[PDB]
Amino acid sequence: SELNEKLATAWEGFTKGDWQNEVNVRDFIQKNYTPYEGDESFLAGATEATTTLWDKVMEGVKLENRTHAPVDFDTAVASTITSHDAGYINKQLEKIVGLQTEAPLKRALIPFGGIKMIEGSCKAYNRELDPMIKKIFTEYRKTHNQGVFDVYTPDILRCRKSGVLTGLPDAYGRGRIIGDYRRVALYGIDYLMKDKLAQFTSLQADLENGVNLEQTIRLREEIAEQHRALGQMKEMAAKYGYDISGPATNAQEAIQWTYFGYLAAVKSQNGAAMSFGRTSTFLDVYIERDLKAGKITEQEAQEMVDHLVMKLRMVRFLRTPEYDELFSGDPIWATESIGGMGLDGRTLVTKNSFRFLNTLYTMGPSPEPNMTILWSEKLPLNFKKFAAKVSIDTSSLQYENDDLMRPDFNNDDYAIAAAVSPMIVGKQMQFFGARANLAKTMLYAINGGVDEKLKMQVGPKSEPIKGDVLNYDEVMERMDHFMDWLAKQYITALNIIHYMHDKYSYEASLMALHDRDVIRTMACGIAGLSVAADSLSAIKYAKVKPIRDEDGLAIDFEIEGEYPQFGNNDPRVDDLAVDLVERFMKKIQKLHTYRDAIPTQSVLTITSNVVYGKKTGNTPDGRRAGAPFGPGANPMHGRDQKGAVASLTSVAKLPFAYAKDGISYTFSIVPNALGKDDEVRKTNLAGLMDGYFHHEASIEGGQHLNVNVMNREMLLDAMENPEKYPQLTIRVSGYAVRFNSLTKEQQQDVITRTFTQSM
Amino acid sequence: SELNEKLATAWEGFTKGDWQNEVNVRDFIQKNYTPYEGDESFLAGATEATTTLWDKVMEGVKLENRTHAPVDFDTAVASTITSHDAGYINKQLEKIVGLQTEAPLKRALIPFGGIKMIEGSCKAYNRELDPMIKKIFTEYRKTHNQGVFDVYTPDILRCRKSGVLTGLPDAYGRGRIIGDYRRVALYGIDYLMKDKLAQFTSLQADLENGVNLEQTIRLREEIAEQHRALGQMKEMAAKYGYDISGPATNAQEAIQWTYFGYLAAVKSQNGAAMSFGRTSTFLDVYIERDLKAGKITEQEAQEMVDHLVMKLRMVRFLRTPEYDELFSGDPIWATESIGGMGLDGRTLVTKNSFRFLNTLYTMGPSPEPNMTILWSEKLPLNFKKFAAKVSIDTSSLQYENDDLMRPDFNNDDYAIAAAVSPMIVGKQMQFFGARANLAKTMLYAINGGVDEKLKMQVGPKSEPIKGDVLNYDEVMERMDHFMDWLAKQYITALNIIHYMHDKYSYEASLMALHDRDVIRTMACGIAGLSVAADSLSAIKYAKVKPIRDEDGLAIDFEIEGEYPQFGNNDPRVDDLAVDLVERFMKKIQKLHTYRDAIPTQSVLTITSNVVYGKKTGNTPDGRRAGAPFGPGANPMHGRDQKGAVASLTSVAKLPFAYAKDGISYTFSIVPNALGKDDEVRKTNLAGLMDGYFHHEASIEGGQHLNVNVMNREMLLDAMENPEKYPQLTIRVSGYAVRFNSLTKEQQQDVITRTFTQSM
Ligand code: NA
Ligand code: NA
């Protein structure tokens, strides 16, 4: 009889299902959500409390952007789930509470990942690290950072320094984990703890029988840590005057409970991406019930959502300047997956879908949360148009192919982690791997493993390519070999990293909100795809002559004739890009991985396009030394000149089947290119996306799309006059940032990118 | 092939061999030691400095015995290799320096093993644990203790509470590891670090190739920790004004360097047994060279040895009262393996062998170091007699069969770890497992798994024997079934323990003095062998009537008729003991173990004979409830009544082939039983041991022998008048203790034991 007296009271009115007898958030959603096909006319505006709160927080935000530094941060407190006291912006006004530290925007110290990065941050921002904290995390509690560097090979160190394998998660939280925070709201902590205890007990037999001994012992300890973490969540919430031992009884509690689950996560881990999940529709179930019972008004519903979202706009992590160049714009990737279609055919779009998007209006444009629209051609036209409208007005949204991912998973409850990495909520995670420099790998092939800037042997010692003119078949053959080498060094580095991360910074509070067994993938990223593809194209269709120095190192290239560049829908070059994605995937696929994580690939870079570009010399495609690579899977800056449909088609050709961790594309189009008025623009934008995401048995389609609707002139004005654009937000690589949050160099990359002038 | 000048100078006069090109302490010993077949006439007496130093330390020792508590201990410092400043008894007098803390006998806090035990100690000895230390080791740095209890099964907890599996290393250092401290003297730290770096690099290929991935990553991290520890040893020594980066250049430096290696170990780990190894003969090589060069006198040689040994008499560890009852007498097991024979036939006995034994004269009797004579019939009669003499005079030595172990290992460089556990120095270690209650297992068989004292279901629920009279076939049948159960719970408990110990308290400084790959055994102990064997005899040769309660649980037994008792050379009972040793061994042998540690067995108990005895009810052999079991493999108190040769023969029958972790026997004989004068006594004692250790292809022989030459009346006087016997030492279970260091109850066990009245 799985139904307590309190569970029945909290679930009064809800439709029965397996979800009442076991942890199954998906079933609860399926049996209870109300599909919405109407428009945005019901949306309410911001309340005075909301505006007062947000305006106060924006003062800290302006300070952050102006100083390019934290407003404040801990120097003597080691952060945990229960370390800090309750903190508020204004307790009398907040409907949803919870801050990482005791003060708005004050960043914490998460030492378990490594003390050296904290020291770097302290010195960079002019603050003194407490000596006791330093001592503890250098002599008593070994950290992730130290575990990794103790096992690294000198080959990996060389790759890190030369810029072929740089920025891997050896100096920051790996992230890429989304605990199902909805579970706290649905079941309450006590129920989840009892479920974890059962999971723990289910491993006893194997333990005693010596079946997979070490793996069993590891999992039991992890589950024990998870159980303990759940208890700490209650203590954390209690500091705020809340008792979350039982299930949420109303809308407010559902939102608060879910957020508390996430709060424990961001108080204990500092993953590069700390995503929210697929929660908007789930929360709609509680909002609908309260509206129907007349307990809450529509404006009050918006306020609750605004306060939740406002908190997500306040997540912060103490990062080093080095991290800042790899992941620019003070990002969090508090990703929310909105809408999508169910497996049964109905849309997963709800009124809450609109409420979340509406936060861009009630509180203005914002980079976080990273609101992602799960697009499908079958979505209600009303929602398609409104999403497009929000993009045109704010450039704060990203779109990802639900018509491609839903069938691939055969699940309608997956969420987007970080930028473009899909996972079934509570049943899957990824071992983050950042990205590798594919372009530099090509130069190594031509230069016999000798780095073109450092002039030292990095890759395998081999003969450099001879001849005054480059030959496609030879170059591709040598590149294929060096890709084997890159694959081995990359997987080896990640194997070490994740072994140490599980050991020294196991994400207990997040894993506590997952099933007993979690599917894991080893996500390998590729940077500079278009630089490599175009370089090969130039070599194949034009006449590329290497300019070598006294030692025979190719330090420049002279190109005779023009050649097809990626992004112009010319198969001659696009097939090469497709080929590269396929090649690397087949290589990492054959290698052994830690905890048997299934290797996956992503054409994603984040700000590595700038960092690797800065460390890569002249390339065969004509790109000059030090120049930024294209963001993610984008064509090189300004090379896609045949309009929107053409560039979208090239990117869509890229095989998601060989890049399951995602394919990022940052698309920027001028207002007039979409139409003369908003109605035409909305219709056209939605149309562009329907074509890009069009999925058929013979046509895979695009996976992701960042959408910026702006004029380059506007950004130029923002560069000169910051104070005039406090909340100006733009998509840059698989997330958004406030334009004023970037450095001058980072902004330089953004303004020199392709601004689509026509369709 | 130019040998580093530092090595060449330091090794001037030494005979060449492989040892100069690789770490090989055994080869150095073989190519350089000088066998000694002479007597003790060369031995010098103590110097004034020695006597002054020791008398001062004895004042602290008296205080320890009187209060049965530490003289002092840390309350706010977490101990590591470099945590403490140099400490001295009197710097102006010490020839060999080094203390665990900054003061003589002051005990340290070794938190990595668990904070709860430290709290218990603080509470028990009226001191308060610094709050910061408690916080660090409960929230930031997880300990061995918490890791084990997080994974334990409720079955193991029950077994722990009932007294069937109690005192396992889940609340104290596992120990059973002997780093080759001789390596520091021979090669110096720098050379060892270079060698470790090579070992680290040798694992790169497998790491990159994904061969045994997790095992490779684990070993690399361990080697990195070892390398780092070696560097810390230099820093530790530097605090004392010594530079040990290079090899020892003389006798004093050889002794000091070796001790420094051991000092790092006892400053960082708190293993139950922290053994010294097989060092006396090794050190003789340096002492001989200095004597021959006239750089040192014989008295000065004795002084150096006295100061080294004096330091070993000062090793202390903060223990809880619970630990005190499991391992009584404030033990350390600083075991030194003396003498033995080489594989080539010459004796490994040297002048230093005599010097070490002579410390019992120069500084009086002492429990530590635990000097163990590697006995062989081929030993020089001069040494055989002197050892026997020392036993007669001090009762401070133990003997172990070199004629049995040397051929078994086919190595002449093995050492005795703890009490009776052999290991090839620097190439082998043991996963300590304490001991299981075999006697209680028999009661469970008869009582259907219900605890005869706690009335709870501990063992598997089965039907209890309904018989009015106990039958051998029926009892043994269930006995076998329950031994299978005991074996499974025991191995499972140890698998968890050692997984956690490798994870949270890896012995870096000790493992740094071992080869890259170390052989590991899972040592399982058996307690109450004689109680179980005799009980089986009372059922197979007499009439046992089970006295049951209102639930049918046998809580007592009636015995009608005499029956054979173990220890009288009566095969009817001896064959049952031998059978039991064989049975349990074959059972644990079939189970999977952590890190593939080869399961071994030992009939050893230490003070568990008292603890388990206290928790075991009446048994079929007639032993009353709460009564102590016999120590180790000893016959039950007073049951062996047919003289020395008879009892020695029974124990010798026990198969070392099925108990590779050792077989302990505590033999106490009255002076007059050995002869009318010392010369006859020495000759007879040596003769008794030659017969006991006699090894033949058809006769295995005894493995270990504790030798006490005393009268019960003497101990009775010591009980009444402590102050009269400050240094009185006795062998009790596989080590020695000062009689005044035991509790009243523990002393009670000792005086009621068998005092052999004749041969
Ligand atoms: Na595609
Ligand atoms: Na034997």
Curated annotation (Swiss-Prot), chains A, B:
Main location, first listed in the record: cytoplasm
Residue list for modification N6-acetyllysine: 62, 116, 194, 453, 540, 590
Annotated active site: 418-419
Source superkingdom: Bacteria
Gene Ontology annotations of biological process type: glucose metabolic process; glycolytic fermentation via PFL pathway
SS bond partners: none
Cell compartments where the protein resides: Cytoplasm
Keyword Cytoplasm: yes
GO MF term set: formate C-acetyltransferase activity
EC number: 2.3.1.54
SUPFAM superfamilies (alphabetical): PFL-like glycyl radical enzymes (SSF51998)
One Pfam family in the UniProt entry: Gly_radical
Residues where Glycine radical is found: 734
EC top class, as a word: transferase
Induction: By pfl-activating enzyme under anaerobic conditions by generation of an organic free radical. Exposure of activated pfl to oxygen resulted in cleavage at the glycine residue harboring its organic radical with loss of the 25 C-terminal AA.
Domain Glycine radical: 631-759
Catalytic activity: formate + acetyl-CoA = pyruvate + CoA
Location of N6-succinyllysine modifications: 62, 106, 116, 123, 194, 453, 466, 653
GO cellular component, one term: cytosol
Keywords: Acetylation, Acyltransferase, Carbohydrate metabolism, Cytoplasm, Glucose metabolism, Organic radical, Transferase
Pathway linked to the protein: Fermentation; pyruvate fermentation; formate from pyruvate: step 1/1
More info: Several mechanisms have been proposed based on complexes formed with substrate analogs. The other active site cysteine can attack the central carbonyl of pyruvate and covalently bind the product acetyl group.
Similarity comment: Belongs to the glycyl radical enzyme (GRE) family. PFL subfamily.
Function noted in UniProt: Catalyzes the conversion of pyruvate to formate and acetyl-CoA. In addition, may be involved in the control of the activity of the formate channel FocA, via direct interaction with FocA.
Name of this protein: Formate acetyltransferase 1
Underlying gene: pflB
